[PDB]
């Protein structure tokens, strides 16, 4: 529950470096 | 002992410590650093909530596991108590004045 | 990863006493 409310964040920053080079 | 942490999680450990591990491979094959100083701070931050997520969930566990006398059997009711048909000790409880002993 | 062996081995020294000071904490 509470658990998975930052596994959204976590999602966050690793498709936030994908746009970041390339 | 890994049960103050849900079991439904310890693979949710290894499947962001590898989303995260894979980006050399990309690095390698398939501005300065701010690549690598934006995954590993919200990385370090998001596993940083991780070890307190379980710190208190551990410690929430551990102060109940520390809140466990005839006041004792008294005052509840889940575990039954008793004495023996028609001796003295039933017979005490049974003409005894006193608020907890005629509670039980 | 440079020095891959003991590092990785790291890891289970890092996460080991994290075991530990957690533990602490909450004891």
Redesign the interface.
């Given at each position: 529950e509470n658990?998975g409310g930052?596994?959204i964040?976590?999602a966050?920053?690793?498709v936030?470096?994908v746009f970041?080079?390339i | 002992f890994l049960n103050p942490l849900s079991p439904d999680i310890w693979m949710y450990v290894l499947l962001a410590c590898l989303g995260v591990s894979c980006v050399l491979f990309v690095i390698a094959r398939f501005p300065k650093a701010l690549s690598t100083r934006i995954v590993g701070g919200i990385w370090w931050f998001f596993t940083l909530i991780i070890i307190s997520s379980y710190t208190a969930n551990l410690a929430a566990f551990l102060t109940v596991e520390r809140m466990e006398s005839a006041d004792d059997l008294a005052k509840q009711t889940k575990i039954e108590y008793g004495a023996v048909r028609d001796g003295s000790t039933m017979t005490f409880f049974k003409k005894s004045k006193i608020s907890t002993y005629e509670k039980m």
């Open positions: 658990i930052i596994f964040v976590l966050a920053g690793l936030l470096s970041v080079a | -």
